[PDB]
Amino acid sequence: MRVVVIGAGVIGLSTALCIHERYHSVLQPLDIKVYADRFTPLTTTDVAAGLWQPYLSDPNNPQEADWSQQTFDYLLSHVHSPNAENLGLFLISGYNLFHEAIPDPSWKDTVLGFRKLTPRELDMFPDYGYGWFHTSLILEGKNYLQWLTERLTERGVKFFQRKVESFEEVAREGADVIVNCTGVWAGALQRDPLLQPGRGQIMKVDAPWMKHFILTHDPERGIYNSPYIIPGTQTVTLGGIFQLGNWSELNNIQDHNTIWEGCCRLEPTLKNARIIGERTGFRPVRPQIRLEREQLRTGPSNTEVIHNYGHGGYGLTIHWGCALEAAKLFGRILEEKKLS
Amino acid sequence: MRVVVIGAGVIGLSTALCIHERYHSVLQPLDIKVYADRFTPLTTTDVAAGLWQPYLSDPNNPQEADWSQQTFDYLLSHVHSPNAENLGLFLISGYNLFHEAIPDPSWKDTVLGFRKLTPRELDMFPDYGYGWFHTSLILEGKNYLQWLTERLTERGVKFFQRKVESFEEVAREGADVIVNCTGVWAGALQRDPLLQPGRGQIMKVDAPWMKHFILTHDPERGIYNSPYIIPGTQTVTLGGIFQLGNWSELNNIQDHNTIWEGCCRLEPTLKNARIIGERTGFRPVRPQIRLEREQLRTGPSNTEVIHNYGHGGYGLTIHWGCALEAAKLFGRILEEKKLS
Ligand SMILES: Cc1cc2nc3c(=O)[nH]c(=O)nc-3n(C[C@H](O)[C@H](O)[C@H](O)COP(=O)(O)OP(=O)(O)OC[C@H]3O[C@@H](n4cnc5c(N)ncnc54)[C@H](O)[C@@H]3O)c2cc1C
Ligand SMILES: Cc1cc2nc3c(=O)[nH]c(=O)nc-3n(C[C@H](O)[C@H](O)[C@H](O)COP(=O)(O)OP(=O)(O)OC[C@H]3O[C@@H](n4cnc5c(N)ncnc54)[C@H](O)[C@@H]3O)c2cc1C
Ligand SMILES: O=C(O)c1ccc(Cl)s1
Ligand SMILES: O=C(O)c1ccc(Cl)s1
């Protein structure tokens, strides 16, 4: 049984790990390879601040809500493990700010100690008059991807720096199952009009007194098109750029100023923080995640493809659930081959 | 009108600032000098992490409850000021962990978003079954002391490195009012049996993923004789040593281990944190702060003395109220001399 996983992002590696943890014992020849064009720290996952929070509105597929909750419980149960430092995982609390009162999220009971903002708390943010406060988790991709890589390598999973041209290309060379975790660039392997790039830009500043995250929201501008501040381990992430359909992997001066004046007005103490870096990424935007199988009628036989892409701006938040779901789908494939 | 402030701690410097802010315009000859045996970073104020939290039990003097609340409001009104980073001031949330249920604190409404710990939150800490959660302030002493110094110097307040031997020594050289902010060493100038050293020891470690404070409580051992973790700007403070009557300004290997074993069992992720430093300090313990005037019938005339010491392990937490109160006592002195 030869499996080929396309994509070294959080979705590809975590999926590869789950599939191995669940079926390495029950498949004698379970050979898993990872074909990826870019590896950490050159993936969209590395640019993400890594905060756990789903979109404020309920998803078109309710399974995602379960996937988010499965991931949060998974990561939380290791927030205090000895190797939590290696995963880039830790607890963090912060504010969600609005202009007008809006309805509680569906994940109010997934995060810890969710509550409305006290009037005294809203006085520190004059431009906003309503919001929440809660404790959540940050899973920094740079560390998490490197941790996943060390586990896959010690499990015999080999890695190859290689751009896949088509699914048949992999099938022809012997792959039995193709796990498509190719993110925003998925259309190049099988055209998908629902997948589009949610371009984002962030800068990382040195502001170690920042102990809370501050996510601001403006329904007119769109989600994450508003200032936000997510303290990381070594640096503080400043963001608020969400440009749909822009394929420019290049830091734009205008967005730089947008991020700066927005966060400096939200946290005036930021004016005297040194800028450490700036990066751009593409949220794999899609009306809903595409986590499903597909029988590829290519060549003499059928190669089994399982898609996992289109996680938008919550890839780190749901990655575990999607991985477990993709592992299930892999299992169902084994039963149909009658080797389970 | 010559004033002399003995002590360059948080109380000595903040009091010297309040006195100048209020009476530099109504006293033509207001010449203030600061006599201190040690200056930053060699004072007890430097050893303290700087967290704002009063003792859990109500104070034997109900004024201090107002002083604590005044300082908090004051500091909170500058948390987003541009020079907040200069003061070492920033918001921070955290936990107070208890083995058993205990009554709420008097300051429950001073801090932001006070609440009890959710069952899920208490599952992170097996050794504790009840606790609080709230947002508070940290005023790092090393920065705050340096900030006060810059304000006082630019106001003409001259500093001198000098060990005062007696109140009469200062009065004989021309002092009109003496502001006694000499802290735990106050006894050497006027014997006080209620003032005793609450020796403490802390170590500062590099664990930038720590975003919350974790204060442990055990009534048997006594307050602050239990593990606590307070993330600062550049480092995390690990403490839990409160030894009454110990005058040894020396790091003790036994207290080192007690601090490490305690905090590592409280936060397992700490076992892989590099130890940056270790310091010993003496809380100026007293049944209640001594903030009062006293006519010293010394020499030909009476030199006015005003005491401000005995703040124990909450100096940073009340320092501002005490400075404002010592400014009032300075005013009444101005009225009595009939130059107000
Ligand atoms: C600015 C920004 C901030 C974000 N912050 C957060 C956050 O705080 N919390 C959160 O949960 N989410 C956040 N996100 C979203 C998150 O980054 C993404 O959802 C997640 O990184 C998606 O990962 P992925 O594995 O699907 O694709 P990405 O990690 O890109 O992985 C793509 C992988 O597929 C490979 N690949 C693609 N095509 C081929 C090919 N043809 N041949 C071989 N290999 C190929 C790529 O080279 C790479 O290996 C943020 C996104 C942005 C842009
Ligand atoms: C380990 C530890 C942690 C703490 N953490 C906190 C905390 O988190 N939050 C909080 O609010 N409080 C905390 N505290 C308590 C706080 O540190 C003290 O209450 C506060 O610093 C009191 O300082 P002070 O200005 O009164 O005197 P200290 O800063 O000692 O200063 C005394 C000053 O008087 C000078 N002086 C003394 N005698 C003479 C003399 N004879 N002649 C000339 N000068 C003299 C000294 O040299 C020094 O200049 C902590 C204390 C300890 C020990
Ligand atoms: O900018 C983004 O895409 C995001 C910010 C915070 C989360 Cl969570 S996603
Ligand atoms: O050890 C101490 O003296 C203190 C710890 C936390 C505050 Cl606040 S004081």
Side-chain angles (χ1 to χ4, degrees), chain A residues 1-78 80 82-145 147-264 266-340, chain B residues 1-78 80 82-145 147-264 266-340:
Chain A
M1 182 54 176
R2 283 183 304 279
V3 187
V4 166
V5 183
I6 296 151
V10 66
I11 303 304
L13 301 183
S14 68
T15 305
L17 186 67
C18 270
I19 295 179
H20 190 285
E21 284 178 323
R22 276 69 194 188
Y23 302 109
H24 83 266
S25 69
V26 303
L27 270 177
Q28 209 292 102
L30 176 55
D31 189 64
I32 305 176
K33 319 181 200 179
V34 178
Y35 290 2
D37 182 28
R38 291 176 174 176
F39 292 83
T40 178
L42 311 183
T43 72
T44 303
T45 295
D46 301 291
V47 181
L51 181 66
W52 189 100
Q53 179 168 316
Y55 291 169
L56 283 52
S57 65
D58 300 353
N60 207 264
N61 180 7
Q63 278 190 287
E64 299 185 13
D66 304 325
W67 293 339
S68 312
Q69 199 267 350
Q70 299 167 3
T71 301
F72 189 98
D73 294 326
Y74 171 65
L75 297 170
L76 182 68
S77 65
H78 295 95
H80 277 38
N83 60 324
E85 183 186 350
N86 297 337
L87 281 67
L89 171 66
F90 61 94
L91 279 171
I92 187 175
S93 301
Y95 312 77
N96 279 276
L97 298 179
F98 308 92
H99 292 110
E100 188 61 38
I102 71 93
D104 292 2
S106 55
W107 43 259
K108 58 195 290 292
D109 293 327
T110 309
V111 298
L112 315 179
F114 183 95
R115 63 171 177 86
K116 271 74 193 205
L117 274 193
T118 284
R120 303 183 61 197
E121 298 183 310
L122 298 172
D123 283 325
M124 308 174 180
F125 311 118
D127 296 340
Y128 303 84
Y130 185 80
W132 322 307
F133 185 106
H134 66 89
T135 296
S136 184
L137 301 168
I138 282 182
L139 183 66
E140 292 182 320
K142 255 167 58 280
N143 285 259
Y144 191 52
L145 285 178
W147 184 81
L148 290 170
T149 303
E150 299 172 10
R151 309 295 147 258
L152 293 176
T153 57
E154 56 179 54
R155 298 213 181 201
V157 185
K158 303 299 91 167
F159 288 47
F160 303 87
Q161 195 280 314
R162 157 188 194 169
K163 178 185 174 183
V164 168
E165 296 297 340
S166 77
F167 295 118
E168 318 183 10
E169 177 185 9
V170 174
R172 291 323 88 191
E173 69 168 40
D176 298 322
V177 174
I178 304 174
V179 188
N180 181 44
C181 305
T182 177
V184 67
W185 306 272
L189 294 183
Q190 168 180 116
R191 171 193 153 272
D192 185 350
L194 305 157
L195 184 69
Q196 46 180 351
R199 177 184 182 275
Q201 182 171 325
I202 73 172
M203 64 187 64
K204 295 180 179 293
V205 309
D206 190 45
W209 62 88
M210 292 293 180
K211 308 301 177 180
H212 303 88
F213 61 82
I214 307 177
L215 272 66
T216 279
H217 306 260
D218 187 8
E220 312 175 301
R221 300 171 55 86
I223 195 184
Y224 303 145
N225 213 13
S226 194
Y228 62 77
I229 305 176
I230 311 171
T233 297
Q234 298 297 353
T235 186
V236 176
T237 301
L238 310 174
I241 301 300
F242 178 92
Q243 302 164 7
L244 188 55
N246 182 0
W247 277 109
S248 178
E249 193 184 48
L250 173 59
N251 292 330
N252 183 274
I253 183 61
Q254 299 314 326
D255 304 329
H256 175 101
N257 295 333
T258 299
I259 299 169
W260 184 257
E261 271 90 63
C263 294
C264 270
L266 181 60
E267 256 291 355
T269 68
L270 240 42
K271 262 92 173 187
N272 299 270
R274 61 196 284 191
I275 294 184
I276 300 301
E278 198 158 15
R279 285 287 298 279
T280 300
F282 302 118
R283 306 174 184 87
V285 179
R286 197 175 190 267
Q288 72 171 42
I289 298 176
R290 191 192 177 188
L291 187 32
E292 68 201 21
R293 287 170 50 189
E294 165 173 16
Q295 260 88 352
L296 212 79
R297 49 216 128 253
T298 290
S301 176
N302 272 252
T303 40
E304 212 69 16
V305 180
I306 164 171
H307 298 279
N308 194 2
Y309 68 82
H311 304 73
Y314 50 93
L316 282 299
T317 298
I318 37 61
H319 81 271
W320 195 235
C322 300
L324 293 184
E325 181 60 20
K328 301 183 196 286
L329 293 179
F330 185 83
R332 285 184 178 265
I333 299 175
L334 297 181
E335 308 187 70
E336 303 190 0
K337 185 55 185 296
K338 287 144 294 179
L339 41 74
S340 177
Chain B
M1 182 54 178
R2 294 178 300 277
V3 185
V4 172
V5 187
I6 299 113
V10 62
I11 306 308
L13 290 188
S14 75
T15 286
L17 178 86
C18 278
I19 280 179
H20 187 275
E21 284 180 327
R22 273 68 183 188
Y23 305 113
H24 87 282
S25 62
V26 299
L27 269 179
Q28 203 285 120
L30 177 55
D31 186 76
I32 304 175
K33 291 178 282 183
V34 176
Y35 292 172
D37 180 25
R38 295 178 176 178
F39 295 96
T40 183
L42 314 188
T43 68
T44 315
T45 299
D46 298 298
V47 176
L51 170 62
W52 185 99
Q53 184 168 319
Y55 290 166
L56 288 58
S57 50
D58 298 326
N60 200 258
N61 172 15
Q63 285 192 259
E64 310 188 350
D66 297 319
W67 298 339
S68 303
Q69 200 275 354
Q70 300 166 12
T71 294
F72 188 90
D73 291 336
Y74 171 58
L75 293 178
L76 191 55
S77 71
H78 293 80
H80 279 39
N83 47 318
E85 170 199 6
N86 294 326
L87 278 58
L89 183 64
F90 62 93
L91 279 188
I92 193 180
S93 306
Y95 312 76
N96 284 259
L97 297 178
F98 302 97
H99 295 289
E100 199 49 54
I102 57 89
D104 283 355
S106 58
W107 41 267
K108 58 184 293 295
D109 293 337
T110 311
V111 299
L112 309 173
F114 185 93
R115 60 179 183 86
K116 273 80 170 187
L117 283 179
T118 292
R120 306 175 59 195
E121 290 175 305
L122 296 176
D123 295 330
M124 303 178 174
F125 312 106
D127 290 3
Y128 303 90
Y130 184 83
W132 311 327
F133 189 110
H134 69 266
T135 314
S136 180
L137 294 182
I138 284 186
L139 186 63
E140 296 192 315
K142 232 159 70 287
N143 278 250
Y144 193 62
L145 287 185
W147 184 81
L148 302 169
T149 309
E150 296 175 358
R151 311 294 141 252
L152 300 169
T153 52
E154 59 181 61
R155 299 203 183 200
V157 184
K158 303 293 89 173
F159 290 63
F160 304 89
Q161 196 268 327
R162 173 185 191 177
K163 183 189 177 188
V164 170
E165 292 294 0
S166 68
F167 291 145
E168 314 187 15
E169 174 187 8
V170 178
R172 293 321 93 186
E173 69 164 33
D176 298 342
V177 183
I178 298 178
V179 196
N180 184 37
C181 308
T182 179
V184 65
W185 302 270
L189 298 170
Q190 169 177 125
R191 169 187 153 282
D192 183 354
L194 299 171
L195 176 67
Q196 43 181 351
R199 180 182 184 276
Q201 189 174 335
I202 67 164
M203 65 183 67
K204 295 179 173 298
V205 303
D206 183 47
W209 62 93
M210 293 300 194
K211 307 301 178 181
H212 302 94
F213 61 83
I214 308 176
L215 265 63
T216 282
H217 295 278
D218 173 15
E220 311 177 311
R221 302 179 50 86
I223 198 184
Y224 301 140
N225 232 1
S226 207
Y228 62 75
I229 298 172
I230 309 172
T233 304
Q234 301 299 353
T235 186
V236 177
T237 296
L238 310 179
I241 292 303
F242 179 91
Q243 296 164 345
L244 192 54
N246 190 343
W247 276 101
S248 181
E249 190 192 56
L250 173 57
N251 285 339
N252 190 277
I253 191 59
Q254 299 309 136
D255 305 328
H256 173 100
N257 295 329
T258 297
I259 297 179
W260 186 258
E261 268 90 77
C263 296
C264 264
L266 183 52
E267 261 282 358
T269 76
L270 239 36
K271 265 99 176 186
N272 292 274
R274 62 191 290 190
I275 298 184
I276 307 304
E278 208 153 12
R279 285 291 299 278
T280 296
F282 301 114
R283 308 172 182 87
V285 186
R286 196 180 193 266
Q288 72 175 37
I289 306 176
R290 188 190 180 185
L291 184 46
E292 77 206 6
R293 290 172 49 194
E294 171 184 15
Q295 273 81 348
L296 221 74
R297 58 218 107 265
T298 287
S301 177
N302 276 259
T303 49
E304 214 75 15
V305 163
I306 175 171
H307 305 283
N308 195 4
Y309 68 84
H311 307 78
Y314 52 102
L316 283 298
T317 297
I318 33 60
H319 83 271
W320 193 240
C322 298
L324 291 180
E325 174 64 27
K328 304 176 186 296
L329 303 180
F330 186 84
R332 296 175 177 267
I333 290 170
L334 293 182
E335 307 188 76
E336 301 185 1
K337 179 63 182 300
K338 293 143 298 179
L339 46 78
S340 177

